[PDB]
Structure formats: structure tokens, C-alpha cells
Amino acid sequence: LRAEHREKMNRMRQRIAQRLKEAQNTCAMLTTFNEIDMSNIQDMRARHKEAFLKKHNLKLGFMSAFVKASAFALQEQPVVNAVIDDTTKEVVYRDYIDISVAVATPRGLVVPVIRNVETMNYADIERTISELGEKARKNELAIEDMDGGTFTISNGGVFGSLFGTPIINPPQSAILGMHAIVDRPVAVGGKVEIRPMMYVALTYDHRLIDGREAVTFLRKIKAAVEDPRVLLLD
Amino acid sequence: MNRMRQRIAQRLKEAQNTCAMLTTFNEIDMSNIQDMRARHKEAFLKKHNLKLGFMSAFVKASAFALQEQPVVNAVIDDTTKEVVYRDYIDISVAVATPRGLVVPVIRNVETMNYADIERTISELGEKARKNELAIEDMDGGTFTISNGGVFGSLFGTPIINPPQSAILGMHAIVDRPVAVGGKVEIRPMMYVALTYDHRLIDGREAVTFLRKIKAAVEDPRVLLLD
Amino acid sequence: MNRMRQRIAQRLKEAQNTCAMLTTFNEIDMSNIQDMRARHKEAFLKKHNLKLGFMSAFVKASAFALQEQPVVNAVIDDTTKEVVYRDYIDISVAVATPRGLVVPVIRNVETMNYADIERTISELGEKARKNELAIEDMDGGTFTISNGGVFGSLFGTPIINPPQSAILGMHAIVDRPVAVGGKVEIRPMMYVALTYDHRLIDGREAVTFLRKIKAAVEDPRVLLLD
Amino acid sequence: LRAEHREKMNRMRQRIAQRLKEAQNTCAMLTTFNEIDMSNIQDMRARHKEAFLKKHNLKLGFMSAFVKASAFALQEQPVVNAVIDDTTKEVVYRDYIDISVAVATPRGLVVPVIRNVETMNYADIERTISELGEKARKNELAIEDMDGGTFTISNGGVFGSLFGTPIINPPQSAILGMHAIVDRPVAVGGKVEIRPMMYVALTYDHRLIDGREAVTFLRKIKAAVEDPRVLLLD
């Protein structure tokens, strides 16, 4: 039996598909990959998760380690923070860092913005994600705090993808895509151990960001997650 | 270049300028398929006069995943800005013969088993080989398998057949060290890819789709269960 | 004894005086069924709200063997001395509740999977438990499974439900030493029995029938193949 | 779709089903089982199968070991050779041994008779089965040499049954049913070895044969297959 039926799409879905194709026809997107060893983050979460819950009443997750390491890399290379506006053919630098965090709730995808990430620590980031996660869950999430982001983390790794290519939020110039954590054999010190590792991806605008600047950017995020004490040093 | 190659390059650029294509990857352990082919390949040839291959395991697992999530089966027609659902499953199979690429269609995959799929591929493989393959059975597919793995590519990005919304790309089988149970074994594994339309399919629905194909090839008894 | 027990003992002796019953035995290794139930019982309960048991593996393997040899599906009617073939498969399942034995019928087993069989047994098990089980759905079966193995019998001889021609009797699962690959392992194995009508079914056709049920329980991936 | 169609059975199948029910309503059938270790037969076939083919142009099988051991047990206990005729209520002894051998060909079951088994050896039995097997295969098998048997071997073991109950050929009083050969663990000498063993069955008439005489009969067949040198001795 061969049955097909035409259901229509509303005017809201019209604009979402319209903005999506404008993001590809504007900027020349490329993608680069790397690989992060997640051993120093898990034992940080293994021994300090109990004193964190007693003192702050929050959960200690992986997400706050990637947001704080992203603000570290952006303030070193400001060209990734930049945006090309094709109205006056201008290059708009910024001096503030607002990282948008895609948190997929039951309803669907929402992308709220964490404001002024430069001065925070892991305790401040965890407050911001938790209470704003409750806002969008019961649908009280405003429009005015969903725009103006300068960089975007995309957790598509809570479902188990190995690696993949993300899509740029069109008022920005780059996006980081984190993925699932698997145990794979690793050659460390000339021996074959098993360590939990993650593939990461970075989709960047090649009109603005150089091919070597995107590699150095993603290599700097790796150094601040394989060893989070670099945030206190250089 | 002739006028036929004019239109092929024309349709190819229309597929990129219409839909916003992205790609996601995963990895399948092919151990339960090979020992199925190791002990049952002799009773299969005596009883059916066919060869037992890898291809029929991917076609049957693809019809299983499509009937669970019908949004991958859908197509956006930009004529009336419509979303066309379908209730039938027709998987197109790219079988590269000596002449070149051909993409015939297997019709109504929902009711078949491995024996029915193997008949359909084998006799239609002989049709396109000696060039008697009609035009009327090359269109209307809803999903596409692309075996580019008979040449030895590690992984790569496929291209969407433009009346469809997704495509699966299988690749070469290599022996790589695998951490299973806290120990380092060697098991034959395959990288797979899924190129999807981001206008229609969500970013989390493409991951769940390819994760469901993996469960029906790492353990083919799920086709009898849920 | 009441007039109901009069007729039950009357029908029982008519089943012996009509057909020439014989019995044949075999032995099934239940290792591939238990690890199927070991890893998929949690995703089965979350997605279907049912329990994953042994019974649905024997009902689906019985419909596989009957559609290959239709002579076991046949019935001799001695009214016109006729041989009545059938093209449908209705397996009767004896489910001993607290009240006693009841034999309801599962209709049209050819198109089902393990999920469909488990729905049919579970909700109809609740009907006969609280005594709302109708008469109209207790007759017309073509084959019968008899679980007398929930009490711990080793093996034994069942009795044919008189409008049918064969009956399968499953039994208890014990761990016994097994010579596999030239070594002595311990594996859970079951004895099975098949009581058949020798007027209709040949002596070699009953052996081939029970050997085919064994192949679809020692390896349940044959249901996807030949 | 529920379709059923009535195809009739011919007048030949009428009588076969008629004779079958007369065999149950006449004699009180019981069944007893035992177990034979087939190790001394297989190494007899392992070393002498080449000199047997060169000198006789025949194949050395399992069947001739069971036919010769059956004529040995019948000439020791003549009561199994007997037949009760209910015409004059008589007990008919016999002094000859004619073993019927059911050899299932492609066409179906046929039961020809081997005549005068008392004087033969393994070479004579193998000639009789082989050339008469070719007769019934191309359908030249006469009627006059299918009746008058006194005992019956039933090879239902070429298909792989474990054990089962056979049916008595109605002019006889007993039937032996051999089965498949499997490797099972065996406690021999206080140790657990693996040896190829066969289950056998004997369906007997309890009107004539005693319950202890059927056990002693099947125990005597076992001794002449576990050790075939008893045929030269006692």
C-alpha cells in the first residue's frame, strides 16, 4: 500500500529554514578536528563532587570545564571573537565574551547566552546554567537573552555521536562541537593504556579566520581541559 | 563534455543549493555479522542458490530505523512549501558495476527478510550489468545506501540524492585495536556516515537514527524484538 | 464425578482410539536464548511494558517449521475420509493458571514477532485468570505447545488435542555436562518431545520437523535467513 | 486470509492407515531403552574399510553389525521369534530368522526382507542390502519378498533423532529402533571421557514376551556391538 499525505509547515518553520540557508551562503565554512583526554576532569569530579554539593547545592558536570576553557582561548586570540558585517564591509571586534550554550531540553533546542564569562569561575558558571535551565524547561525563557552571543558550545554528545560537523549560528564566526566520551586504547609513554577520550570539532569562517589560527585555537582548548591548572598560569 | 554530462553536473549543484547538508559519524563492530556468514553460508547456497553478503544486513536494518522515526522518511517540496510524509520504504542501492554507477530501487522493504533482499539485488545486478536496466525503476527512492567501501576508503562524506532527505555511507572493514571489557582486543570495525538535511531533520534526530542502525548490526536479533 | 468430567474423560479416550500416536525426542541447548534475555530484558520492559520469557521463542520457531512442512498442519477427517490442508497457523498455548489448565489460541502467528506474541499471551493470561475467557476463542487450533516444564519434569509423553495432528512438549531446564568441541562444558539444556499422528505424518517427517525447531532456538537468526 | 482446501486420500492410503490401527488394537505394546557405546565398531571401520572395498567392492557400514547381532540374540531366546495368531489362539514358533530392514529411499519407506540370517557373515549381509537397495531405488522391487519377516530393524537415525518409540510391523512381535550417534561425556573407569554413543529402543508385545525377557534381549544386542568378538564365543 502506497500512501502519502501532505502536511504543511508553519510560518515559524519557514524562517528557521530561511536563516539556515543564509548561514551557508554568507560565510565559507570549514571544519577541523582534534582529540581531548578526559582523565583529569573525571577525577576532579570524583573527589570534589561531594564538597561541591554540600557547599553550593549544585551538580558538578563536564559543561563548565568547556565554557571556562573557551573564554580562556578567546581572550588570547581576538580574531575568533570578531564578526564581518557585509553592510559596510566592516570587521567588528569585541572586547566582551558571551558564550551561547545549546541545552537540548524535552521541548527541543534552545540557545541561551551566558554573559561576561571573563570574570567567572566554575561555581559561577554552574549557577548560571542550572537556574536558566529551569527557566526554558517550564517555558519562561525570554527573547532578549537569546541573542548577541559571540561563540557557541554544542553538546550533541549526550546521545552518543562519535564526531560530526556543526553549523554556525549566523551572527558569530566560530562554533565548538563536543561529543561522546568513549574508552579507547591510547599509546601513552610507549605503552597501550585505555583512557576516556573525546573528539571535538571547530567550524570556522575562512573569510576571516586563517587556516593556522583555527588549529592553534582548538589546540589551546585542549591544553586547558587536559590540564586545568593552565587557567591559573599563562 | 556531452549534453548528458551537462545535466548531471547541473542536478549535482542543485542538491547543494537546496538543502543544508551536515554529516555525522559513528562506528559499527562487525563481529556478529561475520560469524553469521561463517556458519550459515553453506546452507544458504544449497537452499537458495545465492551468496550471503554484508549488504542485506544494512538494507534490513535501514528499513527498521526508518519505520520508527518517520521524519527521516519525509521530503520538503518547495513548490507549495510542503512536508510530504510517506508510508512506504524504498531504499535505493548504489551498485557500482564496471560500466559506472547505477542506483536502482528496492521496493517495499518493510515485509522482506534477508532471503528476499538477496534475490532482489542479485537478479537486478545482472540486469544493469548487461544494460537492460529500465528508467522507470530508478526513481522514487526514499533512502540511499552507498557502498564506497569495496575500494578501501576509511571514511568520507557522501552526497544526497536530491529527491531524498538522507543518505547512509558504509565504508571499508579494517582490524583495529578495541577496548572491550577493560582489555585491548582486535575486532573488525567499520566507520559509517549519515548526510542529512538540517532544514527538516533535527541535530539530535540524526544521531538517534544512526545509533539505531548500529544496534541492529551489532546484534541482529533486535529485528525480532523492539 | 459431574457431567462435565464425564465428557472430558470421553473426549480423551476418543483421541487415542482415532489416531496412532507415537513420540520422538531431541535436545535443545538454551544458551543463546538466555543471554538474549540477559541484556535485552531492560530495554524491552521500558519500551513495551512486558516481560521477556522463553515461551515466545518457541511459538515463533513453531510457526517457522509449520510453514515449511504443511503436512504437519493437515488434519484427517474420517467423515468423508478426507485430508484437510490449511493455510493459516493458529498455535494453542496451554497456560496452567491457579484454577487449572486452559488452552487459548493465538491467531495468525505467521506475521508476528516476539513483541506481538508477548502482548497476546500477557493480556489473555489475565482474562483466564479472573475467568472472563470466552468459549469462541478456545477452538480451531492447528498446533499446541505444552509447558509442563514449570514444575520440573525431565521428559515425558504428551497427549494430542483431538482436532489436531501434532503437539510439542517443552520441559525443565537443567545444567548438564556437554561434550562441545571435544571438551566437557556445562550448559543449560532442555528435552523436548513431539507426539504425532502416524496415519498422516511419516516417521522421517516428524524427525525433520523437530530438528527444525531446534535450529531456530539454538540460533534464532535463522528466522531472518532460510 | 483463512484458506483451507480438501484434497482426498486414495484407496491405498486407506488401507495403510487401516493396518496401522489394527496393530495397536491387537497387541499390548511397551517400550524399553538402553545405550550402546560405538567405539569398537568405528575403529573396525577405520582400518578395515580399505581392504574391504578392494576385495569385495562394497562399503562397510554400521547396519551389518546390527543385523548380525540381532540374529545372535534371536536364536538364544526363541520366544521373541514367536507370533500369537488369534485365529485359533495359537503360539507359532519359528526356526528360521528373517530380519526386515527398513531402508528409506528418496521415494519413501520400503521394508524388504533378508532371508536366512543365521549362516551369514558381514560380507554376505552387505551384498544383500546393497543390490536390493538398488532394486527398490529404481522401482523393480517385488511384492513377494516384502512379507514373512520375523524381526525388524528401523534406521530412523540417518536424520538425527535422539530417541523415540517405533511401531510394530503387525505380523511380528518385536522391533528394534536404532538412532543417531552423538558424542557425550561418559564416566568410564572413574574418569570422564567423551565417546560416541547411541540410544536404542525395543517395542515388544507384552501379551507374549515377559517384561524381564525384553530387557535381557536388548542387553544381549548391546554385548555383541560393544564387543563383536562374542559372536565367535558364547
UniProtKB/Swiss-Prot annotation, chains B, C:
Changing residue 146 to A: Loss of activity. It comes from the Eukaryota. Residues 1-225 are annotated as: Catalytic. It is found in: Mitochondrion matrix; Nucleus. The active site is at 198, 202. The modification N6-acetyllysine is found at residues 41, 46-47, 51, 81. Signal peptide: none annotated. Changing residue 198 to C: 16% of activity. Belongs to the 2-oxoacid dehydrogenase family. Dihydrolipoamide succinyltransferase (E2) component of the 2-oxoglutarate dehydrogenase complex. The 2-oxoglutarate dehydrogenase complex catalyzes the overall conversion of 2-oxoglutarate to succinyl-CoA and CO(2). The 2-oxoglutarate dehydrogenase complex is mainly active in the mitochondrion. A fraction of the 2-oxoglutarate dehydrogenase complex also localizes in the nucleus and is required for lysine succinylation of histones: associates with KAT2A on chromatin and provides succinyl-CoA to histone succinyltransferase KAT2A. The 2-oxoglutarate dehydrogenase complex is composed of OGDH (2-oxoglutarate dehydrogenase; E1), DLST (dihydrolipoamide succinyltransferase; E2), DLD (dihydrolipoamide dehydrogenase; E3) and the assembly factor KGD4. It contains multiple copies of the three enzymatic components (E1, E2 and E3). In the nucleus, the 2-oxoglutarate dehydrogenase complex associates with KAT2A. Interacts with ABHD11; this interaction maintains the functional lipoylation of the 2-oxoglutarate dehydrogenase complex. This is Dihydrolipoyllysine-residue succinyltransferase component of 2-oxoglutarate dehydrogenase complex, mitochondrial. The chain holds residues 229 to 454 of 455 of the full protein.
